[PDB]
Amino acid sequence: EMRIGHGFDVHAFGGEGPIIIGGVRIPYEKGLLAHSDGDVALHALTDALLGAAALGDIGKLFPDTDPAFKGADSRELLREAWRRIQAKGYTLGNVDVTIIAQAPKMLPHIPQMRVFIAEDLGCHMDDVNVKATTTEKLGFTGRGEGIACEAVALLIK
Amino acid sequence: EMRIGHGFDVHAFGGEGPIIIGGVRIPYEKGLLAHSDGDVALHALTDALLGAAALGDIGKLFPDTDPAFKGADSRELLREAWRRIQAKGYTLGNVDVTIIAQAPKMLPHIPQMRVFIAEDLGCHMDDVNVKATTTEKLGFTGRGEGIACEAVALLIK
Amino acid sequence: EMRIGHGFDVHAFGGEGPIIIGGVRIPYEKGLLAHSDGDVALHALTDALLGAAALGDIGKLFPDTDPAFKGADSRELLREAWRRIQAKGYTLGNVDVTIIAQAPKMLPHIPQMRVFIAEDLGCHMDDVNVKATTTEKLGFTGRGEGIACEAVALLIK
Ligand SMILES: CC(C)=CCC/C(C)=C/COP(=O)(O)OP(=O)(O)O
Numbered sequence: 001e002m003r004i005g006h007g008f009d010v011h012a013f014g015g016e017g018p019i020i021i022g023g024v025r026i027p028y029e030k031g032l033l034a035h036s037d038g039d040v041a042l043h044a045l046t047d048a049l050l051g052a053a054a055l056g057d058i059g060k061l062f063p064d065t066d067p068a069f070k071g072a073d074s075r076e077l078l079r080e081a082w083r084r085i086q087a088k089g090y091t092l093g094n095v096d097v098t099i100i101a102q103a104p105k106m107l108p109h110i111p112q113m114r115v116f117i118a119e120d121l122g123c124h125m126d127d128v129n130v131k132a133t134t135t136e137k138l139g140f141t142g143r144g145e146g147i148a149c150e151a152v153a154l155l156i157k
Numbered sequence: 158e159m160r161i162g163h164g165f166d167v168h169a170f171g172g173e174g175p176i177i178i179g180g181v182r183i184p185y186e187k188g189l190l191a192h193s194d195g196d197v198a199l200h201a202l203t204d205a206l207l208g209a210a211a212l213g214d215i216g217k218l219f220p221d222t223d224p225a226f227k228g229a230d231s232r233e234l235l236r237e238a239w240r241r242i243q244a245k246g247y248t249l250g251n252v253d254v255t256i257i258a259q260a261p262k263m264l265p266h267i268p269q270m271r272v273f274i275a276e277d278l279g280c281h282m283d284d285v286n287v288k289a290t291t292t293e294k295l296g297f298t299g300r301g302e303g304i305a306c307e308a309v310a311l312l313i314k
Numbered sequence: 315e316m317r318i319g320h321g322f323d324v325h326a327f328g329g330e331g332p333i334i335i336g337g338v339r340i341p342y343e344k345g346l347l348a349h350s351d352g353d354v355a356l357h358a359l360t361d362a363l364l365g366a367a368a369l370g371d372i373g374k375l376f377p378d379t380d381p382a383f384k385g386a387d388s389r390e391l392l393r394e395a396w397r398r399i400q401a402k403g404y405t406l407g408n409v410d411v412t413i414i415a416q417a418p419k420m421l422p423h424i425p426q427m428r429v430f431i432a433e434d435l436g437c438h439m440d441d442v443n444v445k446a447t448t449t450e451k452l453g454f455t456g457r458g459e460g461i462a463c464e465a466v467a468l469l470i471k
């Protein structure tokens with residue numbers, strides 16, 4: 001039994017940097033409006049992992065309106081979701097994340113993102129891929145209004 | 158042999174509600190312009206299933222311009238595509254769907270979506286995940302101009 | 315060991331046609347601004363293949379700012395990436411690509427795209443799916459400002 005999962009998240013720019021993406025603190029000239037980290041890459045990833053296990057998603061698992069969690073960085077949410085996710089018998093296959101942003105430049109940060117993720121999920125660095133791409137100045141992402149990430153996850157049970 | 162598939166669909170808001178998403182009748186203040194249901198979640202899913210079997214997509218399989226089908230709800234299209242899809246030897250792995258909409262709220266409807274889908278594909282409820290996410294007021298989806306869904310499917314042959 | 319991968323690319327319309335998509339020369343009234351082919355479908359696909367192998371992405375592998383490659387069509391980049399990708403022990407599972415464009419019409423070109431891809435990756439035509447979809451006149455893609463593609467890839471090691 002192998003299980004595929006998809007996640008997608010978005011945040012708007014606002015206030016002052018830096019931002020956190022994939023756990024890394026990246027300097028930039030806005031920060032991200034969010035009730036949390038606003039770490040889009042770990043949000044999308046967490047959702048791909050939950051979706052592959054059919055556990056729903058962050059929003060279900062962790063209500064903005066709910067307890068225990070409202071004081072939360074996205075790396076604890078990820079580690080919590082994974083903790084549930086193994087409790088149903090699952091194990092990691094691989095994981096591939098696509099950050100979609102006009103800036104800032106993600107590339108140099110991209111190794112450190114992967115050690116955070118690989119550590120949080122207990123796997124090897126090489127079950128984790130991350131890339132970033134622009135939308136060439138089209139779209140809300142191209143106008144620098146915010147930042148999207150998609151992710152995919154393969155779980156083995 | 159395992160086979161991965163991706164689908165993506167979009168519809169514009171217009172006219173009066175409710176909408177159908179994932180087979181469920183959801184009350185809302187616009188409805189969806191479409192030559193059909195305008196059920197974005199079953200359209201994207203159907204495409205992820207067809208793509209994983211390399212059968213193309215709805216638009217190929219069922220021309221807006223073509224017969225037998227023009228009088229069609231998206232749940233029959235899904236069941237037809239699946240019917241083809243098993244005829245080439247395939248069997249269901251799992252399926253994860255991401256509705257992207259500012260409103261309405263999908264969450265409460267999300268169990269019933271899954272019994273429709275699981276039934277239509279003949280699997281267990283737990284080979285089916287559905288989530289919805291906002292784009293935080295950016296984008297055509299954030300401006301409430303319409304509604305996008307992505308889906309992924311794993312088939313076993 | 316099976317490995318899943320995701321890619322996403324975008325290009326803006328500008329200048330005179332035709333465009334190249336999936337290797338095919340498609341007549342149209344704008345062409346695509348790009349430092350290269352501007353073939354969005356092979357870019358997204360190449361990234362899904364690289365991501366599944368955890369090799370990063372085109373942009374890493376082939377700097378716009380870097381050598382050996384600046385004189386490059388997207389079909390050589392694809393064949394190069396695949397060439398790396400097998401060097402780490404990987405083999406093709408399947409591949410499903412979703413072109414997102416208001417025009418031109420991709421459908422008639424879609425067989426020939428698949429023989430290019432299948433050939434470039436050395437597989438059968440039927441490990442390759444391609445579809446195109448519109449965003450119903452919403453979005454930068456619906457306003458005909460440019461052209462997006464997503465892709466997913468399954469690799470066997
Ligand atoms: C999976 C994804 C990210 C698909 C395409 C994204 C898309 C068309 C986003 C909205 O663009 P937009 O916000 O430019 O529309 P608007 O023109 O209103 O800014």
Ligand SMILES: Nc1ccn(C[C@H](CO)OCP(=O)(O)O)c(=O)n1
Nearest residue numbers: 101102104105106107132133134373
């Ligand atoms: N926000 C972003 C978007 C893309 N990238 C990677 C990409 C280089 O890999 O930037 C170079 P590009 O301008 O050629 O896309 C990046 O590192 N950060």
Ligand SMILES: Nc1ccn(C[C@H](CO)OCP(=O)(O)O)c(=O)n1
Nearest residue numbers: 059258259261262263264289290291
């Ligand atoms: N249209 C949508 C969009 C998102 N959701 C789920 C999400 C709660 O899970 O809504 C809460 P959010 O406002 O915190 O995103 C939803 O249920 N319906």
Ligand SMILES: Nc1ccn(C[C@H](CO)OCP(=O)(O)O)c(=O)n1
Nearest residue numbers: 216415416418419420421446447448
């Ligand atoms: N640019 C595009 C977008 C979609 N398609 C396929 C689709 C028919 O399959 O066009 C018909 P549609 O207008 O019903 O979507 C296409 O062939 N080219």
Ligand code: NA
Nearest residue numbers: 009010290291
């Ligand atoms: Na979110």
Ligand code: NA
Nearest residue numbers: 034035036038
């Ligand atoms: Na949040």
Ligand code: NA
Nearest residue numbers: 166167447448
């Ligand atoms: Na459609």
Ligand code: NA
Nearest residue numbers: 191192193195
């Ligand atoms: Na339709």
Ligand code: NA
Nearest residue numbers: 133134323324
């Ligand atoms: Na690009």
Ligand code: NA
Nearest residue numbers: 348349350352
């Ligand atoms: Na390019």
Ligand SMILES: [Zn+2]
Nearest residue numbers: 009038040043
């Ligand atoms: Zn988020």
Ligand SMILES: [Zn+2]
Nearest residue numbers: 166195197200
């Ligand atoms: Zn549709």
Ligand SMILES: [Zn+2]
Nearest residue numbers: 323352354357
């Ligand atoms: Zn490109």
